[PDB]
Structure formats: structure tokens, C-alpha cells
């Protein structure tokens, strides 16, 4: 106390975030653009529903459950998936970060659900700090995926510009063609 | 004579080219990757079978009837089609150049089929020159589409490189994320 009051309030906050994401994720599954349900890094990779749920929670939250952004992320991952050298860095985002955050959050929610009374003044202090660090990461990631989408959108746009300048250079007439 | 011998020979050559392209085009329609059959520049554009045939002859010849290249051209045109500002330059390639070449070739084949005897020494000289100029253009274009495909392949490759360096920069760990 009053860390016990702070913890119960931040626990209720996290449980609300979880309830709204459960609803928002359910609609994406019906609207049939839940790519993470079928997403494999390698080819012969097995998919666990519980692990995927946590990944969906992180990735669809950071993209504000927007179909446009969710599809664009699918496209980005599909591009990198082509080269087996990118398999590790995809896993860093999908597992270590996206699943990792939710895994820590579940553990933190459980300590609150178990009872804040069963925790010492030092344990209570650390739990509040940990929750705040995880919530900060959940935002850090959101701001990173935004930059990722900006990088992908910029490249798409640049490709159109380059193709257009090439077309205007060479296809103006018969005389603008490359020599035989 | 012997321009009459040269013309009858170059006419037979053009008729063989036409016969082999007719076969090669027929197989593309069976293997269901003949995008030009359904290709519109604008949205409400009407498609003429005879005009399209000539476009198919030029474009599928230049790409050596390769499915990979034919699909890549479809992708390039689809990208530029998004902006109405690129509608004119697409038409320069599709109609003025691709249909235009075949239209001139048909006229040249007809003058040979009509009879080289019904042509003066000056008309015979000009027809041979014209045929050679058109055959040179058919090569000029082939060497341009090759560069077009190289530009598109380079852009695709550059996009993979950029996305990879972005991923390794920001998704290495939790600490490599963008701070708030």
C-alpha cells in the first residue's frame, strides 16, 4: 500500500486491454485476414495455437487491427521468407519479441490475480516496475512497426517512380528505343 | 532484280516468323498466361481481337514467349496503371510501338504478296529499306524490354536488401526498438 492500490488498478487496465484484443482478434478470424493462424517461418514448421495467440495479440494490437496494415506485414514477412538467411531475424520479431512480451504480461497478471498481499514491499515495487517496462516495450514496438510500414510504403512508391521515368525515357517513340 | 530476289526471300523469312509466332501465341493461350487478351489501359476500355493479336506478336516475341518475363511485364504495367498520369506512356508502348510495328510489317508483306514485279526500281529499293528498318526496330524493342525487366528485377532486389537492413537494425532485441 498504496503500491497494492496501483497494482490492482494496473492489473484491471491489462485485463481490459486483453478483453478488447480478444474481441478485435475474433473479428479478424471471421473477416478471414488472420494470416498468423497459418504463418510458418520455415517450411516444415509446426504451429501452436497458444503461441500464435500471443503473437496475434502483439502484432494486431501494434497495427490497430487495420486490415491494410495486417496485409502489408504479411507481404513484408513473405519477402524476407524467400531468403533462408532472414529466418533468424523473422524469429527475433515473431517469437522473442511478439510472443515474449505477452508471456511476461501473463506472468505479471498472474502475480496480481494470486494476490498482491502475498508479495513483500520489494516484490511489489519490482512487479510495478516490470509492468511499466513491458507496457513501454508494447509502445516501442508499435512505433517500430509504424516505421517498418513507412519503409515498405516508400519502396513501393519508389518502384512506381523508377518504372515511370524508365517508360518516359525509352517508350516516347521508336527513336527513344535502345540501339539494336 | 536482284532486289526482287532479296524481297521474295525477306518475305518468306517474315512469313515463317509469323507462322512460328502464331503457334507460340496459341500455346500461351492454352497455358493460360495470355494477359494481353484481357488487358485494358483505362477501366472502361473496349478490346479489339485484331489489335491485341498484333500487340501479342510484338510483346511475346520480345520476351521469347517466357512465362516468367510475360508475368513480370503484366506486373510492371499493373503498377503504372494505378496512376492515371501513366496512361499515355503505357499507350505509347502498347499501341504506337507494339501494334504500330506489326501494322507496318503486314503492309510490307502485302506489297511482296501483291507482286514485286508491280513495283518500280525505286519502290523496290524503298520497300527493302523499310523492311530492314522495321526488323531493326523489332530488335531495338527486344533490347529495351530486356532493360525494363532488369530495372524491375533490380528494384525488387533493392526492396529486399532495404527491408533486411531495417529488420536487423530494429528487431535484433527489445533494446533496438524505437524509444518513446
Author numbering:
A (entry chain A), B (entry chain B): 70 to 249
Task: Reproduce text from the manuscript describing this model.
The structure of CspA from B. burgdorferi has been redetermined to 4.1 Å resolution in a new crystal form, showing that the bacterial protein exists in a dimeric form which is highly similar to that observed in the previous crystal structure. Presented here is a new crystal structure of CspA showing a different conformation between the dimer subunits, demonstrating a degree of flexibility which has implications for the accessibility and conformation of the binding site. The differences between the two CspA structures are likely to arise from the different crystal packings. However, these structures illustrate that flexibility between the subunits is mediated by distortion of helix F between residues 225 and 227. This leaves the structure of the ten C-terminal residues (240–250) unaffected, supporting earlier evidence that these residues are required for the assembly of a stable dimer. Further weight is also added to the hypothesis that the dimeric species is essential for the function of CspA as the ‘lock’ to the second subunit is unaffected. Despite flexibility in the dimer organization, the C-terminal lock structure is completely conserved, suggesting that these interactions underpin the assembly and therefore the biological activity of CspA. Flexibility also allows alteration of the binding-site confirmation which could enable binding to different complement regulators, perhaps providing a key role of CspA in enabling B. burgdorferi to evade complement-mediated killing.
CspA (also referred to as BbCRASP-1 or BBA68) is expressed on the surface of B. burgdorferi and binds factor H and FHL-1 in the region of domains 5–7 with an affinity measured in the range 10–30 nM. The atomic structure of CspA is known and consists of seven α-helices joined by short loops assembled in a ‘lollipop’-type arrangement. The crystal structure shows the formation of a homodimeric species mediated by inter­actions between helix F in both subunits. The dimeric structure possesses a cleft between the two subunits within which a putative factor H binding site has been proposed following in vitro mutagenesis studies.
